[PDB]
Protein backbone atom coordinates (compact mmCIF):
# COMPACT_ATOMS: atom_id res chain seq x y z
CA UNK A 1 0.00 0.00 0.00
CA UNK A 2 1.41 3.35 -1.12
CA UNK A 3 2.01 5.92 1.66
CA UNK A 4 2.71 9.59 0.94
CA UNK A 5 5.50 11.31 2.92
CA UNK A 6 3.01 13.72 4.51
CA UNK A 7 0.91 10.83 5.78
CA UNK A 8 4.02 9.08 7.07
CA UNK A 9 5.00 12.25 8.88
CA UNK A 10 1.52 12.32 10.45
CA UNK A 11 1.75 8.68 11.47
CA UNK A 12 5.05 9.17 13.29
CA UNK A 13 3.57 12.17 15.13
CA UNK A 14 1.01 9.90 16.74
CA UNK A 15 3.58 7.25 17.53
CA UNK A 16 5.80 9.84 19.23
CA UNK A 17 3.05 11.17 21.54
CA UNK A 18 2.01 7.63 22.38
CA UNK A 19 5.54 6.46 23.08
CA UNK A 20 5.94 9.45 25.41
CA UNK A 21 2.77 8.72 27.40
CA UNK A 22 3.67 5.05 27.51
CA UNK A 23 7.14 5.86 28.82
CA UNK A 24 5.92 8.27 31.50
CA UNK A 25 3.62 5.56 32.87
CA UNK A 26 6.25 2.79 32.78
CA UNK A 27 9.18 4.67 34.32
CA UNK A 28 7.65 4.44 37.84
CA UNK A 29 8.02 0.63 37.51
CA UNK A 30 11.84 0.50 37.60
CA UNK A 31 12.98 -0.37 41.14
CA UNK A 32 16.52 0.98 40.86
CA UNK A 33 19.54 1.52 38.62
CA UNK A 34 23.26 1.34 39.43
CA UNK A 35 25.43 3.76 37.39
CA UNK A 36 29.01 2.61 37.38
CA UNK A 37 32.53 3.96 37.41
CA UNK A 38 32.89 7.46 35.90
CA UNK A 39 31.71 10.55 37.73
CA UNK A 40 33.37 13.95 37.93
CA UNK A 41 33.08 17.73 37.57
CA UNK A 42 32.59 19.55 34.27
CA UNK A 43 33.91 23.12 34.35
CA UNK A 44 32.56 24.91 31.27
CA UNK A 45 34.20 28.00 29.81
CA UNK A 46 32.53 29.82 26.92
CA UNK A 47 35.52 30.90 24.81
CA UNK A 48 36.07 34.62 24.14
CA UNK A 49 38.11 35.70 21.11
CA UNK A 50 39.85 38.63 22.80
CA UNK A 51 40.69 36.48 25.82
CA UNK A 52 42.05 33.57 23.77
CA UNK A 53 43.83 36.09 21.58
CA UNK A 54 45.41 37.91 24.52
CA UNK A 55 46.18 34.49 25.99
CA UNK A 56 47.86 32.94 22.96
CA UNK A 57 50.05 35.97 22.22
CA UNK A 58 51.20 35.89 25.84
CA UNK A 59 52.86 32.46 25.71
CA UNK A 60 53.72 33.33 22.15
CA UNK A 61 51.49 32.27 19.28
CA UNK A 62 54.70 30.78 17.90
CA UNK A 63 54.91 27.41 19.61
CA UNK A 64 51.13 27.57 19.98
CA UNK A 65 50.57 27.48 16.22
CA UNK A 66 53.15 24.72 15.84
CA UNK A 67 50.88 22.67 18.09
CA UNK A 68 48.01 23.04 15.64
CA UNK A 69 49.86 21.02 13.00
CA UNK A 70 51.86 18.69 15.26
CA UNK A 71 49.43 17.94 18.14
CA UNK A 72 51.00 16.16 21.14
CA UNK A 73 49.73 13.17 23.13
CA UNK A 74 48.85 14.83 26.45
CA UNK A 75 48.98 18.46 27.60
CA UNK A 76 52.33 19.00 29.32
CA UNK A 77 52.62 22.69 28.51
CA UNK A 78 50.45 25.80 28.36
CA UNK A 79 51.35 25.95 24.66
CA UNK A 80 49.99 22.46 24.17
CA UNK A 81 46.75 23.46 25.87
CA UNK A 82 46.11 26.56 23.76
CA UNK A 83 47.44 24.96 20.59
CA UNK A 84 44.95 22.20 21.30
CA UNK A 85 41.97 24.48 21.81
CA UNK A 86 42.69 26.31 18.55
CA UNK A 87 43.19 23.09 16.58
CA UNK A 88 39.81 21.92 17.87
CA UNK A 89 38.50 25.27 16.61
CA UNK A 90 40.15 24.63 13.25
CA UNK A 91 39.08 21.08 12.39
CA UNK A 92 35.97 22.07 14.32
CA UNK A 93 36.09 18.57 15.80
CA UNK A 94 35.68 17.57 19.45
CA UNK A 95 38.96 16.76 21.20
CA UNK A 96 40.15 15.80 24.67
CA UNK A 97 43.71 15.67 25.94
CA UNK A 98 44.95 14.68 29.40
CA UNK A 99 46.73 17.42 31.33
CA UNK A 100 49.88 15.91 32.80
CA UNK A 101 51.47 19.07 34.19
CA UNK A 102 50.42 20.37 37.61
CA UNK A 103 51.65 23.68 36.27
CA UNK A 104 49.08 23.71 33.48
CA UNK A 105 46.52 22.51 36.05
CA UNK A 106 47.05 25.74 38.01
CA UNK A 107 46.71 27.63 34.75
CA UNK A 108 43.31 26.04 34.06
CA UNK A 109 41.84 26.96 37.45
CA UNK A 110 43.10 30.54 37.26
CA UNK A 111 41.58 30.82 33.80
CA UNK A 112 38.38 29.68 35.50
CA UNK A 113 34.97 28.48 34.33
CA UNK A 114 31.60 29.99 33.42
CA UNK A 115 29.57 27.24 35.06
CA UNK A 116 29.89 23.83 36.68
CA UNK A 117 27.93 20.63 36.14
CA UNK A 118 28.31 16.95 36.97
CA UNK A 119 30.61 15.11 34.62
CA UNK A 120 31.28 11.48 33.80
CA UNK A 121 28.87 9.27 31.90
CA UNK A 122 27.72 7.83 35.22
CA UNK A 123 27.33 11.28 36.77
CA UNK A 124 25.31 12.81 33.94
CA UNK A 125 23.13 9.68 33.89
CA UNK A 126 22.57 9.93 37.63
CA UNK A 127 21.11 13.45 37.45
CA UNK A 128 18.91 12.45 34.51
CA UNK A 129 17.63 9.07 35.76
CA UNK A 130 17.45 10.15 39.39
CA UNK A 131 16.67 13.85 39.27
CA UNK A 132 14.57 13.94 36.11
CA UNK A 133 13.05 10.47 35.84
CA UNK A 134 13.07 10.07 39.63
CA UNK A 135 14.25 6.49 39.45
CA UNK A 136 16.04 5.50 42.66
CA UNK A 137 19.65 5.62 41.49
CA UNK A 138 22.88 4.30 43.04
CA UNK A 139 26.03 5.82 41.53
CA UNK A 140 29.81 5.38 41.70
CA UNK A 141 31.64 8.56 42.76
CA UNK A 142 35.45 8.00 43.11
CA UNK A 143 36.23 11.32 44.83
CA UNK A 144 33.45 13.22 46.61
CA UNK A 145 34.51 16.68 47.75
CA UNK A 146 31.74 19.22 48.55
CA UNK A 147 32.16 20.78 45.08
CA UNK A 148 31.36 17.36 43.57
CA UNK A 149 28.54 16.38 45.88
CA UNK A 150 26.62 19.57 45.33
CA UNK A 151 26.52 19.07 41.56
CA UNK A 152 24.02 16.30 42.17
CA UNK A 153 20.44 17.34 41.66
CA UNK A 154 17.96 16.74 44.44
CA UNK A 155 16.15 13.44 44.00
CA UNK A 156 16.44 9.71 44.82
CA UNK A 157 20.19 9.64 44.06
CA UNK A 158 22.31 7.56 46.42
CA UNK A 159 25.89 6.71 47.13
CA UNK A 160 26.90 3.66 49.19
CA UNK A 161 28.72 4.28 52.47
CA UNK A 162 30.17 1.65 54.79
CA UNK A 163 28.56 2.55 58.10
CA UNK A 164 30.36 0.29 60.55
CA UNK A 165 30.19 -3.09 58.84
CA UNK A 166 26.82 -1.90 57.66
CA UNK A 167 26.40 -0.73 54.07
CA UNK A 168 24.10 2.29 53.93
CA UNK A 169 22.82 4.27 50.98
CA UNK A 170 22.94 8.04 51.43
CA UNK A 171 22.70 11.08 49.19
CA UNK A 172 26.02 12.50 47.92
CA UNK A 173 25.76 15.68 50.02
CA UNK A 174 25.57 13.41 53.07
CA UNK A 175 28.73 11.58 52.01
CA UNK A 176 31.14 14.47 51.53
CA UNK A 177 34.78 13.87 52.40
CA UNK A 178 38.13 15.60 52.02
CA UNK A 179 38.91 14.27 48.56
CA UNK A 180 40.16 15.51 45.20
CA UNK A 181 38.21 17.61 42.75
CA UNK A 182 38.16 15.68 39.48
CA UNK A 183 37.69 18.44 36.91
CA UNK A 184 37.27 18.26 33.17
CA UNK A 185 37.57 21.76 31.72
CA UNK A 186 35.26 22.05 28.72
CA UNK A 187 35.92 24.88 26.27
CA UNK A 188 33.17 25.56 23.72
CA UNK A 189 32.99 27.81 20.65
CA UNK A 190 30.00 28.70 18.40
CA UNK A 191 29.43 27.61 14.80
CA UNK A 192 31.46 30.69 13.94
CA UNK A 193 34.27 31.61 16.31
CA UNK A 194 37.00 34.17 15.60
CA UNK A 195 40.61 33.73 16.72
CA UNK A 196 43.83 34.97 15.00
CA UNK A 197 43.09 33.80 11.45
CA UNK A 198 41.39 30.52 12.16
CA UNK A 199 37.63 30.23 11.98
CA UNK A 200 35.41 27.50 13.37
CA UNK A 201 33.17 25.75 10.79
CA UNK A 202 31.05 24.20 13.52
CA UNK A 203 30.13 24.65 17.18
CA UNK A 204 32.30 22.12 19.04
CA UNK A 205 34.50 21.85 22.15
CA UNK A 206 37.93 20.97 23.57
CA UNK A 207 38.27 19.10 26.86
CA UNK A 208 41.28 19.49 29.13
CA UNK A 209 41.15 16.44 31.41
CA UNK A 210 42.85 16.86 34.80
CA UNK A 211 41.21 13.72 36.22
CA UNK A 212 43.66 11.18 37.66
CA UNK A 213 41.06 8.80 39.12
CA UNK A 214 38.69 8.11 36.27
CA UNK A 215 41.75 7.76 34.04
CA UNK A 216 42.54 4.47 35.77
CA UNK A 217 39.01 3.58 36.82
CA UNK A 218 39.83 3.48 40.56
CA UNK A 219 36.97 1.89 42.53
CA UNK A 220 35.60 3.00 45.88
CA UNK A 221 35.93 0.54 48.78
CA UNK A 222 32.20 -0.13 48.77
CA UNK A 223 32.24 -1.18 45.13
CA UNK A 224 35.21 -3.48 45.59
CA UNK A 225 33.79 -5.00 48.77
CA UNK A 226 30.04 -4.50 49.17
CA UNK A 227 29.09 -4.89 45.52
CA UNK A 228 26.75 -7.82 46.20
CA UNK A 229 25.01 -5.72 48.85
CA UNK A 230 24.56 -2.81 46.42
CA UNK A 231 23.39 -5.06 43.58
CA UNK A 232 20.64 -6.34 45.85
CA UNK A 233 19.12 -2.88 45.57
CA UNK A 234 18.74 -2.65 41.80
CA UNK A 235 16.89 -3.98 38.77
CA UNK A 236 19.15 -2.54 36.08
CA UNK A 237 22.76 -1.40 35.63
CA UNK A 238 24.59 0.83 33.16
CA UNK A 239 28.38 0.43 32.93
CA UNK A 240 30.77 2.96 31.36
CA UNK A 241 34.14 4.71 31.55
CA UNK A 242 36.26 1.71 30.46
CA UNK A 243 37.18 3.22 27.09
CA UNK A 244 40.04 4.91 28.91
CA UNK A 245 41.96 1.76 29.74
CA UNK A 246 45.45 1.37 28.32
CA UNK A 247 47.20 -1.95 27.76
CA UNK A 248 50.21 -0.87 29.80
CA UNK A 249 50.92 1.78 32.45
CA UNK A 250 54.36 3.10 33.50
CA UNK A 251 53.99 1.63 37.00
CA UNK A 252 53.95 -1.84 35.51
CA UNK A 253 50.20 -2.25 35.83
CA UNK A 254 47.80 -3.24 33.02
CA UNK A 255 44.21 -3.06 31.82
CA UNK A 256 43.68 -6.64 33.06
CA UNK A 257 43.90 -5.42 36.65
CA UNK A 258 40.71 -3.43 36.10
CA UNK A 259 38.76 -5.70 33.75
CA UNK A 260 39.28 -8.56 36.18
CA UNK A 261 37.44 -6.51 38.81
CA UNK A 262 34.76 -5.50 36.30
CA UNK A 263 34.15 -9.08 35.12
CA UNK A 264 33.44 -10.18 38.67
CA UNK A 265 30.88 -7.40 39.01
CA UNK A 266 29.10 -8.60 35.89
CA UNK A 267 28.99 -12.11 37.36
CA UNK A 268 27.30 -10.81 40.53
CA UNK A 269 24.88 -8.75 38.47
CA UNK A 270 24.11 -11.85 36.44
CA UNK A 271 23.77 -13.93 39.58
CA UNK A 272 21.00 -11.59 40.66
CA UNK A 273 19.52 -11.32 37.17
CA UNK A 274 20.23 -7.60 36.96
CA UNK A 275 19.80 -6.34 33.39
CA UNK A 276 22.94 -4.47 32.37
CA UNK A 277 23.73 -2.10 29.53
CA UNK A 278 27.27 -1.41 28.35
CA UNK A 279 28.08 1.94 26.75
CA UNK A 280 30.73 0.82 24.27
CA UNK A 281 32.47 4.17 23.87
CA UNK A 282 35.27 4.29 21.31
CA UNK A 283 38.31 2.42 22.67
CA UNK A 284 41.52 3.50 20.92
CA UNK A 285 43.56 0.59 22.27
CA UNK A 286 43.04 -2.54 20.20
CA UNK A 287 44.00 -5.11 22.87
CA UNK A 288 41.72 -3.38 25.34
CA UNK A 289 39.03 -3.15 22.63
CA UNK A 290 39.28 -6.88 21.99
CA UNK A 291 39.01 -7.57 25.72
CA UNK A 292 35.89 -5.45 26.04
CA UNK A 293 34.28 -7.29 23.10
CA UNK A 294 34.87 -10.62 24.88
CA UNK A 295 33.11 -9.19 27.91
CA UNK A 296 30.02 -8.39 25.83
CA UNK A 297 28.49 -11.87 26.19
CA UNK A 298 28.02 -11.05 29.88
CA UNK A 299 25.91 -7.95 29.19
CA UNK A 300 22.19 -7.86 28.36
CA UNK A 301 22.42 -4.71 26.26
CA UNK A 302 24.92 -2.59 24.29
CA UNK A 303 24.82 0.94 22.96
CA UNK A 304 27.06 2.31 20.24
CA UNK A 305 27.30 4.72 17.35
CA UNK A 306 28.76 4.38 13.84
CA UNK A 307 32.44 4.85 14.65
CA UNK A 308 32.15 2.40 17.52
CA UNK A 309 30.23 -0.29 15.63
CA UNK A 310 32.79 -0.04 12.83
CA UNK A 311 35.70 -0.25 15.29
CA UNK A 312 34.26 -3.52 16.61
CA UNK A 313 33.90 -4.84 13.05
CA UNK A 314 37.55 -4.13 12.38
CA UNK A 315 38.79 -6.21 15.33
CA UNK A 316 36.09 -8.82 14.77
CA UNK A 317 37.84 -9.05 11.41
CA UNK A 318 34.95 -7.82 9.24
CA UNK A 319 37.00 -5.01 7.69
CA UNK A 320 34.80 -4.62 4.60
CA UNK A 321 31.68 -4.16 6.72
CA UNK A 322 33.34 -1.59 9.00
CA UNK A 323 34.16 0.53 5.96
CA UNK A 324 30.55 0.64 4.77
CA UNK A 325 29.31 1.16 8.32
CA UNK A 326 31.58 4.20 8.57
CA UNK A 327 30.18 5.08 5.14
CA UNK A 328 26.84 5.26 6.90
CA UNK A 329 25.12 2.64 4.74
CA UNK A 330 22.07 1.65 6.78
CA UNK A 331 21.76 -1.86 5.35
CA UNK A 332 25.40 -2.37 6.27
CA UNK A 333 24.78 -1.15 9.80
CA UNK A 334 22.03 -3.76 10.16
CA UNK A 335 24.46 -6.38 8.85
CA UNK A 336 27.10 -5.41 11.40
CA UNK A 337 24.49 -5.47 14.16
CA UNK A 338 23.45 -9.02 13.23
CA UNK A 339 27.06 -10.12 12.96
CA UNK A 340 27.75 -8.75 16.46
CA UNK A 341 24.73 -10.55 17.89
CA UNK A 342 25.82 -13.77 16.19
CA UNK A 343 29.31 -13.26 17.59
CA UNK A 344 28.32 -12.48 21.18
CA UNK A 345 24.84 -13.82 21.78
CA UNK A 346 23.96 -10.47 23.37
CA UNK A 347 20.24 -9.89 23.99
CA UNK A 348 20.01 -6.31 22.72
CA UNK A 349 21.95 -3.81 20.62
CA UNK A 350 20.89 -0.16 20.45
CA UNK A 351 22.56 1.69 17.61
CA UNK A 352 22.22 5.49 17.41
CA UNK A 353 23.40 7.91 14.79
CA UNK A 354 22.30 11.26 13.37
CA UNK A 355 18.83 10.89 11.90
CA UNK A 356 17.76 7.51 13.28
CA UNK A 357 18.19 4.77 15.88
CA UNK A 358 18.12 1.01 15.39
CA UNK A 359 17.65 -1.71 18.00
CA UNK A 360 18.24 -5.39 17.38
CA UNK A 361 16.69 -7.53 20.09
CA UNK A 362 16.16 -11.24 20.59
CA UNK A 363 12.77 -10.58 22.19
CA UNK A 364 9.87 -8.91 20.40
CA UNK A 365 7.40 -6.18 21.17
CA UNK A 366 6.46 -2.56 20.59
CA UNK A 367 8.19 -1.45 23.81
CA UNK A 368 11.51 -1.45 21.99
CA UNK A 369 10.17 1.07 19.47
CA UNK A 370 8.44 3.35 21.96
CA UNK A 371 11.58 3.32 24.11
CA UNK A 372 13.66 4.45 21.15
CA UNK A 373 11.00 7.13 20.50
CA UNK A 374 11.09 8.31 24.12
CA UNK A 375 14.91 8.43 23.97
CA UNK A 376 14.75 10.52 20.79
CA UNK A 377 12.45 13.04 22.49
CA UNK A 378 14.73 13.13 25.54
CA UNK A 379 17.77 13.78 23.33
CA UNK A 380 15.96 16.61 21.53
CA UNK A 381 14.75 18.17 24.78
CA UNK A 382 18.30 17.99 26.16
CA UNK A 383 19.86 19.54 23.04
CA UNK A 384 17.10 22.19 23.11
CA UNK A 385 17.30 23.35 26.72
CA UNK A 386 20.88 22.28 27.26
CA UNK A 387 19.83 21.28 30.76
CA UNK A 388 16.83 19.14 31.77
CA UNK A 389 15.14 19.36 35.14
CA UNK A 390 11.60 18.04 34.92
CA UNK A 391 10.13 15.22 32.85
CA UNK A 392 7.71 17.73 31.36
CA UNK A 393 10.34 19.69 29.44
CA UNK A 394 10.58 16.55 27.30
CA UNK A 395 7.01 17.18 26.14
CA UNK A 396 8.30 20.31 24.40
CA UNK A 397 10.44 18.17 22.09
CA UNK A 398 7.29 16.94 20.38
CA UNK A 399 7.28 20.25 18.53
CA UNK A 400 10.63 19.45 16.98
CA UNK A 401 10.17 18.24 13.37
CA UNK A 402 11.07 14.60 12.73
CA UNK A 403 14.00 13.90 10.44
CA UNK A 404 12.19 13.70 7.09
CA UNK A 405 14.96 11.79 5.31
CA UNK A 406 14.84 9.02 7.91
CA UNK A 407 11.14 8.76 7.09
CA UNK A 408 11.88 8.33 3.40
CA UNK A 409 14.47 5.72 4.44
CA UNK A 410 11.84 3.56 6.09
CA UNK A 411 10.31 2.87 2.69
CA UNK A 412 13.44 0.91 1.75
CA UNK A 413 13.39 -1.09 4.99
CA UNK A 414 9.79 -1.81 4.09
CA UNK A 415 10.58 -3.37 0.73
CA UNK A 416 13.56 -5.23 2.19
CA UNK A 417 12.26 -6.65 5.46
CA UNK A 418 9.01 -7.80 7.02
CA UNK A 419 7.68 -4.71 8.82
CA UNK A 420 4.70 -5.90 10.84
CA UNK A 421 4.18 -2.39 12.20
CA UNK A 422 5.89 0.96 11.69
CA UNK A 423 9.53 0.77 12.69
CA UNK A 424 9.01 -2.88 13.59
CA UNK A 425 10.52 -5.76 11.60
CA UNK A 426 10.02 -9.48 12.28
CA UNK A 427 13.10 -11.63 11.75
CA UNK A 428 13.40 -15.39 12.24
CA UNK A 429 14.92 -15.30 15.71
CA UNK A 430 14.99 -11.59 16.53
CA UNK A 431 13.24 -8.29 15.99
CA UNK A 432 14.50 -5.05 14.44
CA UNK A 433 13.06 -1.68 15.41
CA UNK A 434 13.71 1.54 13.49
CA UNK A 435 12.86 5.06 14.57
CA UNK A 436 13.27 8.37 12.67
CA UNK A 437 14.67 10.91 15.14
CA UNK A 438 14.40 14.61 16.01
CA UNK A 439 17.44 16.71 15.13
CA UNK A 440 17.72 20.06 16.87
CA UNK A 441 19.33 22.77 14.72
CA UNK A 442 21.88 24.70 16.75
CA UNK A 443 21.54 22.92 20.14
CA UNK A 444 22.37 24.30 23.59
CA UNK A 445 24.34 21.74 25.62
CA UNK A 446 25.25 18.75 23.43
CA UNK A 447 27.54 17.50 26.21
CA UNK A 448 25.72 14.38 27.39
CA UNK A 449 23.34 13.59 24.54
CA UNK A 450 24.64 10.11 23.75
CA UNK A 451 24.29 9.11 27.41
CA UNK A 452 20.80 10.55 27.43
CA UNK A 453 19.88 8.49 24.37
CA UNK A 454 21.14 5.14 25.61
CA UNK A 455 20.03 5.29 29.24
CA UNK A 456 16.54 6.65 28.45
CA UNK A 457 15.72 3.89 25.95
CA UNK A 458 17.28 1.12 28.01
CA UNK A 459 15.55 2.13 31.22
CA UNK A 460 12.11 3.00 29.79
CA UNK A 461 12.00 -0.08 27.57
CA UNK A 462 12.54 -2.21 30.65
CA UNK A 463 9.80 -0.47 32.62
CA UNK A 464 7.43 -0.94 29.69
CA UNK A 465 8.32 -4.63 29.26
CA UNK A 466 8.18 -5.09 33.01
CA UNK A 467 4.72 -4.07 31.83
Ligand X SMILES: Nc1ncnc2c1ncn2[C@@H]1O[C@H](COP(=O)(O)OP(=O)(O)O)[C@@H](O)[C@H]1O
Any idea which residues carry the catalytic annotation?
451
Nearer to ligand X, 104 or 313 (CB): 313
Residue 92 known to bind ligand: no
Shortest separation between residue 161's beta carbon and ligand X, angstroms:
30
Binding range to ligand X, per CB under 6 A, among 167-175, 193-201, 364-372, 436-444: 436-444
Nearer to ligand X, 270 or 393 (CB): 393
60: left (phi over 0), alpha (psi -120 to 50) or beta: left
Q: Which of 180, 153, 157 minimizes the C-alpha distance to 169? A: 157
Shortest separation between residue 125's beta carbon and ligand X, angstroms:
12
Q: Does 35 contact ligand X by CB under 6 A? A: no
Q: Which residues, numbered 326-385, are part of the site for ligand X (CB under 6 A)?
A: 352-354, 379-380, 383
Cα dihedral: 204, 143, 263, 325 (round 10)? 0
Q: Does 388 contact ligand X by CB under 6 A? A: no
Residue 370 known to bind ligand: no
Q: Does 402 contact ligand X by CB under 6 A? A: no
Q: Which are the contacts of 160, defined by CB distance < 8 A and separation ≥ 6?
A: 138, 167, 168, 169, 220, 222, 223, 226, 229, 230
Nearer to ligand X, 79 or 306 (CB): 306
Residue 451 known to bind ligand: yes
Shortest separation between residue 302's beta carbon and ligand X, angstroms:
12
Cα dihedral: 142, 144, 145, 150 (round 10)? 130
Residue 120 known to bind ligand: yes
Q: Does 443 contact ligand X by CB under 6 A? A: yes
Shortest separation between residue 144's beta carbon and ligand X, angstroms:
24
Is residue 221 within 8 A of residue 196, CB to CB? The reply is: no
Handedness of CA 166, 171, 174, 179 (dihedral sign): positive
Shortest separation between residue 351's beta carbon and ligand X, angstroms:
9
**What is the distance between the alpha carbons of residues 190 and 232, in angstroms, rounded to a whole number?**
45
Q: Which are the contacts of 259, defined by CB distance < 8 A and separation ≥ 6?
A: 242, 245, 291, 292, 295
Q: Does 190 contact ligand X by CB under 6 A? A: no
Is residue 120 within 8 A of residue 241, CB to CB? The reply is: yes
CB atoms near residue 199 (< 10 Å) = 13
Nearer to ligand X, 169 or 373 (CB): 373
**What is the distance between the alpha carbons of residues 336 and 226, in angstroms, rounded to a whole number?**
38
List, in sequence order, every residue forming a beta bridge with 43; answer none if it has no partner. Answer: 116, 185
Q: Does 444 contact ligand X by CB under 6 A? A: no
Residue 353 known to bind ligand: yes
CB atoms near residue 163 (< 10 Å) = 10
Nearer to ligand X, 86 or 304 (CB): 304
Nearer to ligand X, 180 or 314 (CB): 314
Is residue 436 within 8 A of residue 12, CB to CB? The reply is: yes
Residue 42 known to bind ligand: yes
**What is the distance between the alpha carbons of residues 144 and 159, in angstroms, rounded to a whole number?**
10
Residue 211 known to bind ligand: yes
Q: Which residues, numbered 447-466, are part of the site for ligand X (CB under 6 A)?
A: 449-450, 453
Q: Which residues, numbered 295-324, are part of the site for ligand X (CB under 6 A)?
A: 305
End-to-end CA distance of the chain: 32
Residue 305 known to bind ligand: yes
Shortest separation between residue 453's beta carbon and ligand X, angstroms:
5
- How many residues make contact with ligand X (CB under 6 A)? 14
Q: Does 149 contact ligand X by CB under 6 A? A: no
Q: Does 184 contact ligand X by CB under 6 A? A: no
Annotation: binding site for D-glucose: 42, 96, 120-121, 184, 211, 451
Instruction: Summarize as ranges the residues that interact with ligand X (CB under 6 A).
Output: 305, 352-354, 379-380, 383, 439-440, 443, 446, 449-450, 453
Known binding site for Mg(2+): residues?
279, 308, 451
Amino acid sequence: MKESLKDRIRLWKRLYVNAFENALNAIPNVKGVLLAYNTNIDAIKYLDADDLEKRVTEKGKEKVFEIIENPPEKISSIEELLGGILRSIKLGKAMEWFVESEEVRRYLREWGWDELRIGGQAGIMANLLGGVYRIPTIVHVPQNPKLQAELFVDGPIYVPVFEGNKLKLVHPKDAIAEEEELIHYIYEFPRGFQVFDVQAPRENRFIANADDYNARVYMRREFREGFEEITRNVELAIISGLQVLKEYYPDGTTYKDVLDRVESHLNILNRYNVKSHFEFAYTANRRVREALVELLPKFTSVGLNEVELASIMEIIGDEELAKEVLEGHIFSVIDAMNVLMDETGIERIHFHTYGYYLALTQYRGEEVRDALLFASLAAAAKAMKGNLERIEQIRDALSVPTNERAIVLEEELEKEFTEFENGLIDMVDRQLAFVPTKIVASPKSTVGIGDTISSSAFVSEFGMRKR
